[PDB]
Amino acid sequence: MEALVLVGHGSRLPYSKELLVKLAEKVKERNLFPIVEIGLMEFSEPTIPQAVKKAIEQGAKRIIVVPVFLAHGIHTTRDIPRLLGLIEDEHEKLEIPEDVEIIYREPIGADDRIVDIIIDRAFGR
Amino acid sequence: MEALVLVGHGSRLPYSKELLVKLAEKVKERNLFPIVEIGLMEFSEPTIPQAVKKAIEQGAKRIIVVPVFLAHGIHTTRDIPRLLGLIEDNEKLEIPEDVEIIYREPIGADDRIVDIIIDRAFGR
């Protein structure tokens, strides 16, 4: 079965995980994916290696990794695709079995729907 | 006069500013705000103090500051509101007495974000 892993930055504060948890609930309710997991790059659990390994353990053969970041940065272009084994080079460590494929997706970017949210927020809504 | 100031994290890489620039053009095209400026918390320029000051200079007495961040973090709960003069503390933003700053809320777990995430999952 396919899995979605949502991946976030992580924070010293708990808002970043809380955001990822809520988003995962919302996408679970769209019934697109049997398995939906979250990972945080830094600070808190679950880690990205932990989330990938938890989706393999549920028997996922195709894992979609969506970086929930607004723009590309060091995490989206280096730290994350390294962990997932997609580009080369005491860490975490993630082994990916041969029959598992990781599909690393694109961040949010300057999407029109973000300008919608910006306008709502401008009016305190 | 109503300025909207979009405020972002900033990074050592240039993509974060590029995102703020692009979003500011896109909100300009909605024609809701006469003045639209961007500021970056860290690393990049313009700074948040620089952006707010450059809105005052164009004569806005109402400046809306919208945090373009997914979740709250230390910048949105401490650094940005300190800078704007809305909380106590203990390169310098003045803020004249005839201008009001309205600090808004970050993006959060909006339904539109889950729509974007689903698009991104299928590679659109």
Side-chain angles (χ1 to χ4, degrees):
Chain A
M1 347 180 58
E2 304 190 320
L4 185 58
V5 171
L6 303 188
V7 139
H9 184 309
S11 175
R12 290 190 214 247
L13 272 29
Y15 294 116
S16 180
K17 197 219 180 93
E18 188 211 54
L19 195 246
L20 258 262
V21 163
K22 250 163 197 150
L23 283 176
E25 273 158 26
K26 282 168 164 206
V27 336
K28 261 193 253 86
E29 285 176 18
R30 301 262 218 293
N31 290 304
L32 286 168
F33 299 101
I35 300 158
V36 173
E37 286 310 344
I38 66 138
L40 278 331
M41 245 293 101
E42 293 176 355
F43 297 104
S44 49
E45 268 170 299
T47 66
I48 288 153
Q50 274 179 46
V52 172
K53 127 140 192 93
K54 220 216 120 156
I56 298 167
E57 238 278 329
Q58 299 199 57
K61 261 60 216 155
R62 195 170 172 266
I63 298 134
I64 306 312
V65 182
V66 168
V68 173
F69 291 70
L70 296 154
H72 273 299
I74 319 60
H75 287 340
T76 70
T77 65
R78 280 141 169 236
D79 306 359
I80 292 169
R82 294 206 273 64
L83 280 166
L84 304 180
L86 261 12
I87 52 152
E88 244 226 38
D89 277 32
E90 237 299 292
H91 56 272
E92 191 74 11
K93 248 180 166 138
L94 223 208
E95 249 123 24
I96 258 72
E98 278 286 325
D99 74 321
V100 181
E101 76 158 325
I102 314 284
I103 302 303
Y104 177 55
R105 288 326 204 178
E106 215 58 5
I108 297 181
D111 196 291
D112 279 338
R113 290 169 280 193
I114 277 151
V115 6
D116 288 338
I117 295 163
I118 289 152
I119 283 143
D120 280 353
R121 290 295 170 268
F123 292 104
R125 259 56 181 185
Chain B
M1 190 190 184
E2 244 162 65
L4 173 58
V5 173
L6 300 182
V7 134
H9 185 44
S11 68
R12 316 179 311 120
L13 272 52
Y15 301 118
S16 180
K17 189 206 191 172
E18 198 203 7
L19 197 253
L20 256 264
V21 174
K22 229 269 207 83
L23 290 173
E25 283 145 25
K26 287 210 220 206
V27 344
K28 262 178 265 104
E29 288 185 48
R30 312 293 260 241
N31 285 297
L32 287 163
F33 296 102
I35 305 159
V36 170
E37 235 79 63
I38 64 137
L40 281 327
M41 244 282 115
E42 289 186 344
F43 304 108
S44 324
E45 238 185 341
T47 70
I48 291 155
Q50 238 157 58
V52 179
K53 316 222 211 109
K54 130 160 229 215
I56 297 180
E57 137 228 317
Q58 309 181 228
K61 336 129 208 283
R62 187 150 128 111
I63 297 127
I64 309 315
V65 173
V66 172
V68 180
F69 290 68
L70 289 152
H72 276 293
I74 221 300
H75 303 295
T76 68
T77 67
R78 185 245 267 162
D79 306 335
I80 293 164
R82 250 174 201 181
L83 210 141
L84 304 176
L86 317 154
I87 62 182
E88 216 196 281
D89 9 25
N90 314 125
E91 302 222 331
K92 195 211 137 267
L93 176 61
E94 235 318 287
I95 288 165
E97 290 281 311
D98 77 311
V99 350
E100 135 177 77
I101 310 281
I102 290 147
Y103 174 54
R104 292 315 196 183
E105 216 59 12
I107 298 180
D110 203 294
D111 289 317
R112 304 175 243 31
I113 289 308
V114 3
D115 297 335
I116 299 168
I117 282 156
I118 286 143
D119 285 7
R120 289 297 175 268
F122 297 107
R124 352 183 223 21

